[PDB]
């Protein structure tokens, strides 16, 4: 992986926050690995980008 990303935007499909446990809503998703998360996930999320 290389560098993460965080842009405020809404998803055009059902998503899910890997930091919390249920679907995800309009939050911040990385447009490189496909990350997504609410406000409880802005401290552990910024440090990863492993996408296959
Ligand atoms: Zn990323
Ligand atoms: Zn979350």
Short mmCIF file of C-alpha atoms and ligand atoms in Angstrom, two decimals:
data_model
loop_
_atom_site.label_atom_id
_atom_site.label_comp_id
_atom_site.label_asym_id
_atom_site.label_seq_id
_atom_site.Cartn_x
_atom_site.Cartn_y
_atom_site.Cartn_z
CA UNK A 1 0.00 0.00 0.00
CA UNK A 2 1.05 3.68 -0.16
CA UNK A 3 -0.57 6.77 1.45
CA UNK A 4 -4.19 6.83 2.72
CA UNK A 5 -6.98 9.31 1.79
CA UNK A 6 -9.91 11.04 3.55
CA UNK A 7 -12.43 13.13 1.55
CA UNK A 8 -15.82 14.16 3.00
CA UNK A 9 -18.49 12.71 0.67
CA UNK A 10 -21.56 10.42 0.59
CA UNK A 11 -21.50 6.86 -0.84
CA UNK A 12 -23.75 5.83 -3.76
CA UNK A 13 -24.40 2.38 -2.22
CA UNK A 14 -24.71 0.58 1.14
CA UNK A 15 -21.36 0.85 2.98
CA UNK A 16 -20.14 -0.23 6.46
CA UNK A 17 -17.66 1.25 8.99
CA UNK A 18 -14.95 -1.33 9.80
CA UNK A 19 -14.16 0.75 12.96
CA UNK A 20 -17.68 0.59 14.37
CA UNK A 21 -19.78 -2.49 13.33
CA UNK A 22 -22.83 -1.46 11.20
CA UNK A 23 -23.40 0.28 7.86
CA UNK A 24 -21.65 3.64 7.27
CA UNK A 25 -23.28 6.95 6.33
CA UNK A 26 -22.05 10.24 4.77
CA UNK A 27 -18.57 10.35 6.36
CA UNK A 28 -14.99 10.14 5.08
CA UNK A 29 -13.81 7.41 2.68
CA UNK A 30 -10.32 6.86 1.23
CA UNK A 31 -10.52 6.92 -2.60
CA UNK A 32 -7.41 4.69 -2.92
CA UNK A 33 -8.15 1.56 -0.86
CA UNK A 34 -11.93 2.06 -0.40
CA UNK A 35 -11.91 3.03 3.28
CA UNK A 36 -14.96 4.54 4.99
CA UNK A 37 -15.75 5.76 8.57
CA UNK A 38 -17.85 8.14 10.82
CA UNK A 39 -16.29 10.49 13.54
CA UNK A 40 -15.27 7.65 15.97
CA UNK A 41 -12.72 6.56 13.41
CA UNK A 42 -10.45 9.54 12.62
CA UNK A 43 -7.58 8.50 14.98
CA UNK A 44 -6.99 4.82 14.09
CA UNK A 45 -8.14 5.00 10.44
CA UNK A 46 -5.40 7.50 9.33
CA UNK A 47 -2.48 4.99 9.10
CA UNK A 48 -3.47 2.26 6.59
CA UNK A 49 -4.30 1.64 2.90
CA UNK A 50 -3.93 -2.13 2.27
CA UNK A 51 -6.20 -2.71 -0.76
CA UNK A 52 -6.02 -5.74 -3.09
ZN1 LIG B 1 -6.54 4.28 1.88
ZN1 LIG B 2 -17.15 4.39 12.42
#
